[PDB]
Design a protein around this nucleic acid. Structure first.
Ligand SMILES: [Ca+2]
Ligand SMILES: [Ca+2]
Lengths: 131, 131, 131, 131, 131, 131
RNA sequence: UAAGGAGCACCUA
RNA sequence: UAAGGAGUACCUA
RNA sequence: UAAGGAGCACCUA
RNA sequence: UAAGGAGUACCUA
């Protein structure tokens, strides 16, 4: 897994391609950025993999996408983050797990995010409780 | 009411369907497990949603998928858990975010987990660092 | 009383239908929301019913309707609650009360809210004291 | 001046009119009761309006409706209170709200209390929880 | 097991349907009540399930049905509970049990209550001991 | 209530008849057992009725059904109990109750166990809590 | 808060 | 744990 | 503040 | 009295 581009699609009317491009690796944590050239508007996606002491294999994804409005006056722009959204995924695997297993695992949780998975969607997207 | 079934497809040759049926809700943390008639080694999936004081809505998805095989002790065949895979997801949205934003947001990370997304896959599945 | 939609009409020139739709039940307190997709603009209506220890039957309604202006800049909207209005109703009934009784009770207080009930209206709506 | 009569209709077969006549004002809390010549088991309705320091106007309506029946003790027939029903209403408005807002606001909650509003009625009248 | 309505038939000449509507859930203990119109004498049916630490699932049902009669004191008619009947069914399954096993279990115990099983009926209904 | 045979049907595809023959009566506690041919794993159903001093008739039924499997140790086949399921129904009537009242009571509770009463079934058989 | 660590949404700084 | 106890998932051994 | 609890707008944390 | 606890009408608070 060499640091490279990563292109995520959103759920827009006609899917848009957000293209994060390598920014760097700092302490075994890769960062990829979808940017304009201005650090705060940057939506960043990071990823890491560590083997704990007890021998479990953990890895973490983090995606941060800020919403920023740029006020413009006589030519000078003044960006300001008006709100942000963050999400973190953490896989905890067993040193005896097989690739197939792991894969299916991801597959499942990945699938659980789909828009039609009512139970989930209404919460992660519509912010409704469970009851 | 809210808590209902949930079916996740895995990434097998011909994607299987794991049907999680509701189990309970404790502390506004809904659980829905998918299992055989026995309450052992059942793959659980939970979902919660709290609104912090700061005024941020943040929900949590947690999926546990234990691998079970049958062991034989004096002819006493019993299914048992050999190992477990865990994954947690945490969304933290701003109370001023719009449904679209959130949706696209989910959609993206949703996309990030994925057979083809080299960067990510090779790590959360092949357990290979980033370089 | 299963959590369902609830449609309240306002006193607009030609009555408008605000349609609150189920959000969830948290600790025996149902919430229904008239929403846009953005949590703060949400006008919420909650309702509960508890039997006290001494054997009285209490129930509580709460309605919160925020006024929010959305500033828009080059496409990015920035909602902000500029003021809110809250109201709470609490019924305290006796374990020996009959339905008819209770009903009429509600009927009365309900009627007391009408626009033509001068004594009340001038206060709850025009913020005038009594004298 | 301000405190005057107030007539509330109940939900009987042919809606009756309960005419509350003024009684007194103590602490800027106006009371208007509806009763027969005797000061016992009279249904009282009160209304107040204070302006908190925060700069919020909030008024309070309180209605008490006791059920009275005549008991006979040694031929000494006397009406007595067997049980009482209470209901309190609390409006909290923003000192920058407009007459319309407030009116619509009241109108809505006014609407919420109502024979047909299933959700609410079944609870504040049938005393049934929400699910 | 969504807290919902529970309808129970009795052994009357031509079976009556007592409909217990939900009331609430306190500590993972649902409570459905069947009211007359007057909260007093309302029959309550509660239910709960806890999972011990020894891998045992215990479930508890309680049903309570009071008998009410209007007592008259000096022309004051008042409905009151003269006596109540209680019952507590209580299961204790082993975390290793089949879903089928459990069903049959209940099935049997349930059958035992049947009106014709002379052995139990004469005791739980005719108050005879065994001999 | 002569200690006699008690035949219990189960929920099997095509209902089986488990016949509990008497065993004995110890302290006004009858015990009927259904054996396989081998005393071990025999399911026991006990029943008793005591009259408290406060004029309350209490009755208690207990049913126990073990699951047996032949374990093999060095060519030694031995039938053994791997797990058991227990249940304790328990009535508490008032010495002033009608014979009819009691019947209806049982009737209902008995009905509640029915396989279709989703509320209870999912709990006592599918181990789901309430929510 | 944690690229902290566990597992019948828990415990450690 | 109670074929303990009750104007009740609540106390007593 | 309280889905706290009462009753000739009161009292409890 | 216990939505206490169990290779069980039997112990624990
Ligand atoms: Ca005999
Ligand atoms: Ca529910």
């Amino acid at each position: 897994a060499q640091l490279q581009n990563l292109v995520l699609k959103d759920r827009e009317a006609t899917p848009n391609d957000h293209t994060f491009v390598p920014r760097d690796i700092r302490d075994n944590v890769g960062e990829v950025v979808e940017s304009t050239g201005v650090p705060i508007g940057e939506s960043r996606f990071t990823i890491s993999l560590r083997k704990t002491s007890n021998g479990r294999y953990k890895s973490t994804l983090k995606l941060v996408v800020p919403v920023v409005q740029s006020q413009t006056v006589n030519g000078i722009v003044t960006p300001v983050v008006v709100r942000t959204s963050y999400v973190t995924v953490d896989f905890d695997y067993d040193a005896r797990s097989t690739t197939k297993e792991r894969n299916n695992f991801v597959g499942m949780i990945a699938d659980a995010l789909k828009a039609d998975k009512m139970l989930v969607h209404d919460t992660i997207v519509n912010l409704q409780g469970v009851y």
